[model samples]
Target: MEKFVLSLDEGTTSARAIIFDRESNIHGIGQYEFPQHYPRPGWVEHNPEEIWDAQLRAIKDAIQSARIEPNQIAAIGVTNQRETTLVWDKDGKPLYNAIVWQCRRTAEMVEEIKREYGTMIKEKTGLVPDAYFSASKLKWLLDNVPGLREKAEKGEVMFGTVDTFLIYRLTGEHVTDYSNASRTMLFNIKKLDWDDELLELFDIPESVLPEVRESSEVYGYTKKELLGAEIPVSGDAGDQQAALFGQAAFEAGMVKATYGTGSFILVNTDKMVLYSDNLLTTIAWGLNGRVSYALEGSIFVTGAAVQWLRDGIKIIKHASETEELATKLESNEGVYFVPAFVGLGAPYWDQFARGIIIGITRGTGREHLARATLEAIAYLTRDVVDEMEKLVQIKELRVDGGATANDFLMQFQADILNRKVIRPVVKETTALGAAYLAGLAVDYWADTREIAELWKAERIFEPKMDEKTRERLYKGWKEAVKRAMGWAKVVDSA
Candidate 1:
């Protein structure tokens, strides 16, 4: 029997491959950062080839780092940055750079669609017209790329999110899992198929769509020429949903929040696609005998808020200094930072919003700023969690990802919610989830029960702050968001 399962976690800023032993403990890890493209203001892109190169490098590094022979690896599992759109030609060449989920280039098209067929789309897709989803992005490419729509009609072009794109390169098969397909807005969650009405509305061709499969099924095999092993390629899902599975959110209402570049919260709903007026309904994952649905809340900025302090302002030498600096401050000192750096997501869904730092006085320094930035993420997460609490019955949050490492933020999160925040010993749940899904399919482990044994918590944050203080602070953040919205001003021509 093969000794390992390698999970490829191709994320927003980096590509990583994690090797998990049979016990589901991660034994080897390799990660490589890649460049991001900002062609114009409010536009985000990624070179498909760059992502591919990084993925290859990370896989090799992971295997070498494990000190395990290539043959010991059994299968490849994939989880990715959802909704980052990519288009490639029949020969597997990216036509234009990938228009990332962060890009606001499709705002105009979203407006047009809203005016025309908004109700139709919302009814079928359960998504509001927005640049954040992939349908509008596909339209932008079709409209701008000259005769590319014609190529799409003849099946000479392919459209996919990062997961589908990577799998195409890995196996020469254009396939994506249902969890990823749900984010495209072109897919009908109810019908469980591509909506022709949406494709026509967005001027997208169904022929260019990847074959949608269940998350844990074998879509294809990794082309041996690339990985040095002919591993069965299985289990592809977006990061948040992958984390939900990885955390064993198998029961309805079980929730997980990943605090990474962005903060995302997901609640597994078993088979109930319960609609949320304030959140988006997503496919958590489909496996075994059941399909799971989740109500997801997305915060546009989380760790990036701290990264801005590190890179944008150079307040701290590294991201690690944030917690120490934050702990130094007794409080934010009435300071509230709304990290709408890329605009607000979930509930508000305001794209025109910008970052704001309020309540700064002469006494305000790096410590206050650090505390405010750390508090900013907690407050933003609290807003969404509040909504999530109303939408579902969430008692606890299983937290993972980079930002959860911040002791201040985790405690703040518990205080804000007045609930417990559980942090796992292995924070890389997204990668682990993908691996478990794939490994289960290939019998890498006995079953989900065996996989559950591997998940152990490192710590739990219990609410220590008083409720009065939490509400007072959170209310201030709500107002700060209001001020941040619609701050973009253009000269009015007389």
Candidate 2:
């Protein structure tokens, strides 16, 4: 009998494969970091062929490392960086590099969209008009590429997010899950399908879109020639949504946050699609003819600030050093860092924001800078949680990802938000969530209840800081954020 499920976790910075057993123990793992292209300022791209090839290599490496036969795998699950747009021909050839979700190349286009269709889009899609979603990126491709629109109109072109692209490449089936489709800004959250209004608004032909599928159903089988076995390709979700499922946030007000290059907070709202003017309403996952909704607060930079301390400024030897350095400082000491490297997301949603540091003094040192960076992450999280609490009270925050290993950050997160922060025994919930979905589809596990039982907490952080101190520190962070906003506009006018 098969004892493991293989999960393909395709992320913004890398592609990883993790093999999980029924006990939720990870047997083997393989990862490869692909290069990101910055063609122009605020633009990001990836070669679709490079991404697929890297994923295949990682899968083979993981299986070999586990010393398991291909047939021992029960099924394959896929979770990917959402909103990264791709367009290809019927022959499975990419017309251009994939436009990443972070790319702001379509900012001008999104502005035009906001002027014309802002209210209608938000009503249907539950998303604010921005360059962050896939619709604007897709429109840019069709308009910029010569003869592309004519081909698309004739049904010669195909559009998809990363999940659909990989699925089509593996199984020759053009399908995507509901969670991913919702991120495209082309799908209506209420209807659960691509909207004709959005399609016409963006001038995107509906024929190019993939068929929507449930998150945990068998879409197709992997081609025999690729994996040496006919494995069922089942289960797909956007990375953030998959993490929410991974953390077992299946009930209302159950919340989880993934700490990576950026931090994303998702609160499951069950059946009710509670709308927020600031936070985004997105489909968490769909199963058994039922779709769950979530309110999300997307923070653009968190762990990246730590990386900058290591690589950009050369202050730290490794990312692990951040914990010790941050702990060394008794307090932020009036220094505050606003990590708006690309821009600020969520309630603020300031695209022209720039990174800024305030209250730096002669007494400031690397330890203070490190502490400030970590504090920025916690503060940004509070910025999200503060808005979230207004709509629904979050009992606790389930946390995962590479950065969660930092004890100082987690404790500060709890302190800033004044809520309990729980870290799971397995930090790779993104991959584990994908595994759970695929396992459920094949009955590798009995049900979600079984998977939920497998989840164990490695640590739980409780708020310890005094309210006075918390308020003082958070007050400084808010002030620093104001100084960072509209920085580009001020510079351009000068």
Candidate 3:
């Protein structure tokens, strides 16, 4: 049997596994979506064990479907939904459900700290003082859960994002990469270490933290009983940064976007940090004792709105039908949707914002709604890239993710940005990135230079829309967003 890099992609809404050969060809894939618990509005909790089970099943399924022995796996690469916080004991048992990144349960907590630590955090950690990051969520878990603090102080309990949790479970090592560590808000991006002042502010102990490591080095080996082989767990990253690496966006000014549960745009700024007031500066990855930096704009809901169209409202049967349905209209007919399902992110970090659809009429149909939803993602991408254009001169966007399959959406993205949109041959850049890092670590590939030569573009989309029309539509979109801002009122915590 031949060896391949196995990538386990733990996402916001789903857990997927993929195996890639040396040339970056996918041999097999497995996917499973874990359940989401919204005990209160604006709160998103995920059972860590459930997600682990989903991840485990995904791995088994991929191996079984691939018709390969477990020994054929070269190394395991893990990339996950960053900032979702969890805690467990030394015996590998979870103490509480993971607090999802989109959960605004910590919004009030963030507001209280924003006054004191907002500027300090931005300068030190390259993050805004928002509940979207892990520090606040981990603090909430430490404070609210009974005896959690005492347990954590004594090292009976632990803290982790999804990546850390899975790594700990797989290899008995509590560690995270530079990319995931930067999202914790507790980490000082400047020093690349956990900030003591932020830890004091949150009242968290150092005992519960994970050891930080580089993105591509071997951390440990997975327990043989788990996967039938002692596979080396080598590569680790947050999903967005992994996608950035997978896109081979290694040079300064190279940008990439992944239309996942939400849409995120990232620019590889290399070692130079170009901080933006409305965006975030983060460590892209640490390789060979050197840290690469990034600028990011995160949109909370873009592709998720289509999932809502199918599951939430039953407007469509499957996500693929959206492309055909969205093209049914010459335009949105003035209809627009602000899909702030868990409030807005980036450029405008309003936690109280909720989804809203405006300009509906008697003649409006599902097709129009689908068209508007697809258009909203493009508009949001335009918003992120707008922030990018202001800070960097990015000539084109290297795009990946599920949405790249939608030619209509890709073309619309190009038109809206009035720039070139490039799609890669393998749109599953998230999983591929993890695979690349792992493969590189195990000598399945040589270096970034070798991987760069393997990268190829499948298509390029050029802007066709006129400037005046683009402005008019964007103007309408801005108005629609204004209507949705703070639509959900903050009630006193019960």
Candidate 4:
């Protein structure tokens, strides 16, 4: 008697299919991690077909786990890793493996363009000129693959971010939402369309691009053969934007921080487009005829820092053990760590930055380093919040993702920023947001107000550390992080 929403969450690491009901409770879930390829030193690739098959398996897995008929699914929503790119033919055959956002093969290309059109690119795309976006990768693919561009010119090949790929394969429609398009570094945020001159500048053919759409509208219905019933392929967003929506950050000042492998901080700016030299101005999503904008910054290391201790460093047996070890120390013992293992994001966007540990002494032990790791995570978040506060007033910080369970980090985050940190009852807000968006289109939920009503915080951490202590710890962080930068730069040959 009840209809549900299915959210296909294709992330950098895995494909997840989740089914949820009216009360926003997850009924069934399936996840599949596909293989990743690193053909070169700084390249990351994914076979597009492998990604599709993984999602297919995950979807059927979810339906069978829920013990529900496919006919009960009202709609399908999609949220995916942004900036990862791929090209395929009109018949949906991939031309090459997807160039992941993490790939740095286009760094030279980015630097070459940075001096010439950096200002114009920033003004048009609201993105800092970097290889972390889709434009350079897309450009590289179009040029590197033999004969692919020729086919593209004749309207035979197609381009897509992960969301478009999934939606297209699901519904036989080549479409993407504004949130996903904004990451391409080719979309003009002001005009809400692909920038022609910029495309020309980048040497990208228009034939390969997808038609942009509203984040919550029904783009098309899924093929009956795929899901047993034709469900509306409704909502679509990039992962962080979806998390913002999932957290019910519906107002201008509301913000959400997701502490996944990396930490992503996004503040909903609503219609106001605030540009930052260090931060990103991105389309949060387009709902109705209106578009919402956000100022975002991401930290490249957070949980990944902890994972290093467990797996790479082998200092700790379990990630959970870091909590107790960290807490055992009264403080970090004047130890400081900068976990810029793969450079930095957010305010410092320093690609040359590498990891470092500082202010170590004979008294410093594994506990000090462990505590320092947690403290660094909180400090990096404060770095982003400081930047966001300059332009928009952020209400209490809404927190989600795997690392939100760390009580120490949550309290420390509050202490550093002197703002309340809120964790919701439902931590998986990315998939949840996708479900809500799809649910909205089908009248399962009335409106944004209805969705906002469902946001209930399970825990709240208020600032506990005094301002003086917070300032001292943060001062140490600034010094350590500053020293970590420029490590990857080649020295003078002379």
Candidate 5:
């Protein structure tokens, strides 16, 4: 009768279920990608029912694949895409499709109101006044949806991020973790409550918000009929924060970067909430009565640039093929690429920026383009790490995600930052982190110390390039970024 932890990871594009033991080894995983709807340009959505059905399917598949009885699962953990907005009723039915975090339907609204709410939003939420958050998206639904505001004001509607939505369905609890709540741009990080001013500012009803809870507490038990046995639903966090915990970045100054479609670099800052002009100050997690904070640098594009090279340009057969093609070239040879596909994030925050390639000559080949694509990932990471260095000293970086499998990118990232980059033996740290939190709550694991000991580094990439060469390459990148900024505005206005 061996016991295990179940992690339900609902991300931007897919739903995943993973089973892990106390040693952090993944026994089996099931993932399913659902349809993404784009009704108009800059508008992205997902059917809430489809997301739920896919997630339930993945959970059943994972339990079967793991060959474990329902009783063997000690607890359940949940991690999800933060800031994806959903509004629902008491019976747990979503009123509309989920407004994805990447959607920009409220961009104009954010710009217009920034003059009035910019300072207060930054001071309270520690987030820039941008449509990338849930507040504006939630406002849009309340304002545009017919009779919805009346229903919300009468306390018939509930607003939630993906975590709250999933938990409410699983355990009948309308609760969210601090990490997810912090991204809503309505929650006051210092007070640990939804701000009255923000609700008024957005014209939202206080009754619509979910109760905020600690990340590792027993939220509730899953309904007995749902999982065959009532398992304690114990842990919930935003995906990035969960990855930080999974990496065991417990001490202040420890940092982890996850490279997916975009890249996020987060540094633990203990209990102190440190603000940045460019980076976001977010709650990493809450345990007991204490909360830990983090400084996050969000890069809009990193791994997606590789996807563009593979799918958009057809320059490479597979994403992994870029590794061999990139190393084949001796150097970038003065060629530079700035992947501002959706604008630059952190330090620049330019929404109107577009992609550009500079310093290319007749001598440039597809190899150079492929190499530049890989180099751009490292360069973008350096942009965030450099900004992080100003606020707190970053000694080494722990890396994860699909792109971390590339050896060439890892070495280049280390060289660009002039710091060691460590990858874990278990690449699925996001799922592992959620499992760790749930296991802790159920006493399936003794403590954080025991969990930390389970973490082992699979590879450590050390900086190989000289200091002068590193600086020279990074300087070229800065120039390329400058050229890419505001190109969209110039073209659109014309």
Candidate 6:
């Protein structure tokens, strides 16, 4: 009677299904990236059907990859891209494209709401008025789509982020996890429920909103029509919070930073609801009806900076080359490249910033640029870490994600921050977190303490760089980013 957990990690780029064994180790992994729709500049969208199709394929592939029967999977957990808005009809069909978290379509709407309802919204929801959340996207559909608003007013159209969308398809239940709900601009993080007034302001009907539930509860079993397994789909959460819980940041003051296309740094404040002047206040996750809070700082472009060096500029063959090239270069050679292709995030909330390279000399080549790219990622992480230190309670940071696999970036991050940077034995902590949540709900696993006993650190990068060198380099990065700001026109704001 061996048991396993199936974790569906639905991200912006792809849908992944990971099978975790009893030892909390990966038994199998299947991932499939779907087509991304860019209907207009600064607008990112995804086809709902494609997302469902990819997720279904990945789950089946994962079961096959694990060489396990469907019945062996005892529970299922879900972690997804938070705040990407999508709507579906009565019979489980999408009405339009899913607006992504990276999309800028709701910028003006966020601005207008801030002007009119900022105080009320922030006080209630613990979020600033920005297109980064779901309320505006939901509003966009209500106002723009033909006859949709009237129908929504009449309780016809339903609103959800990706997680709820998946739940709807899997169990035919319209529900959302507390972690995912808090990211939307409509939910009250403190009250742990949706605000009816907030919904009215956004012109969203309360009828269509999903019920917010605890992350680890047994929501429902997946319908056999969708997948072969009658898996009890129990856990659900946003990716960053899932990483935090998965990393065993249980007590207050623990921090985690995920190095991906964008760097998200979160500090577990436990039940303390500390608002941020420089960061986002997010729900870490809900367990047993007790809500935990965290401070979030978003770095708009991180590993994507490395991708730019490889794909955008064709400077390197792969993201790995930047590390070797960085070691070859002695210094940035007074050169600074701000990897703000999308804009600066957190502390400095400039959406108009474009990528820029300063101190360019005729002698400067690809190697110098490569090293700058790596250093730039480290510097960006440092920025958020500094802000989190000031505004919230934070000790050492737990690091994970694709970019953390780079020794140079991890070691440099440790050196720059002068802290012990720990990378987990399990790099796919996002998926692991979701699986842990699901496993605990179904009695396949007992509790968080049991899960914590299984988590192991594979490596530790200690700080060795001197303080003066770190400061001088950091100062250069600041100037480069300043120059990058005010370069490109962000059409949403325009």
Top-lDDT candidate index: 3
List, in order, the clash count of every candidate structure: 0, 0, 0, 0, 0, 0
For residues 1-494, could you state the per-residue lDDT of candidate 2 as single tens digits?
Answer: 65799999999989999999999888999999898999987899999998998899899999989989888889899999999999999999999899999898987668776877878998999898888999989999999988888999999998999999999998989999989999999999998989999999888988889999889989899888888889998889999999999898877888999999999999999899988888889999888788999999998889889999999899999999999998997898999989898878998877789999888899999999999999999999889989988988888999998888888999999998888999999878998888888888889888887788898898999999899988998988999999999886567541
**Candidate 3 local lDDT, 318-355, one digit each (tens):** 99999999898899999999999877898888888889
**Which structure among the candidates has the greatest TM-score?**
2
Where does the lowest 10-residue lDDT sum fall in candidate 1? 485-494
- Tens digit of lDDT per residue, candidate 4, span 132-241? 89998988888988988787789888899999999989998999999999999999999999999789988898988999999888989988888899889989999999
The model with the greater TM-score, 1 or 2, is 2
Which window of ten consecutive residues has the lowest lDDT sum in model 5? 485-494
**3 or 5, which is superior by lDDT?**
3
Model 1 spans with C-alpha error above 4 angstroms? 489-494
Superior by lDDT: candidate 1 or candidate 2: 2
Per-residue error (Å), model 4, residue 210: 0.2
Give a tens-digit lDDT track for model 1, residues 1-494.
45899999999999999999887778888899999998877889999999999998999999988888878888889999999989998789998888888888877668666777767776777676778899988888888988888878888888999999988988888999889999999999888889988887777878889988888988888777887778898778987899998898878988889988898998888889887666788888878856788888888898999999999999899999999999997878889888888667987877778889999899899999899999988888787888887867789999999888778889989998899999988878999999998888788877777777788888999998887898888888888889988665342234
Model 2 score (lDDT): 0.90
**Residue 126, candidate 4: how far off, in angstroms?**
0.9
Residue 288 in model 5: lDDT: 66
Give the residue spans of candidate 3 off by over 4 A: 490-494
Each prediction's TM-score against the native? Answer: 0.97, 0.98, 0.97, 0.97, 0.97, 0.96
The segments of candidate 2 whose C-alpha lies over 4 angstroms from its true place after superposition are 492-494
Q: Taking the tens digit of each residue's C-alpha lDDT, what string does model 6 give over 92-200?
A: 7888889898887877657566778877887887776777889888888878988888877788777898999998888888999988999888898877889889888
Please give me the total number of clashing residue pairs in predicted model 4.
Answer: 0
By summed lDDT, the worst window of 10 consecutive residues in model 4 runs over 485-494
Where's the lowest-lDDT run of ten residues in candidate 3? 485-494
Q: List lDDT for all candidates, in order.
A: 0.86, 0.90, 0.91, 0.88, 0.90, 0.85
> Candidate 3 vs. truth: CA RMSD?
1.6
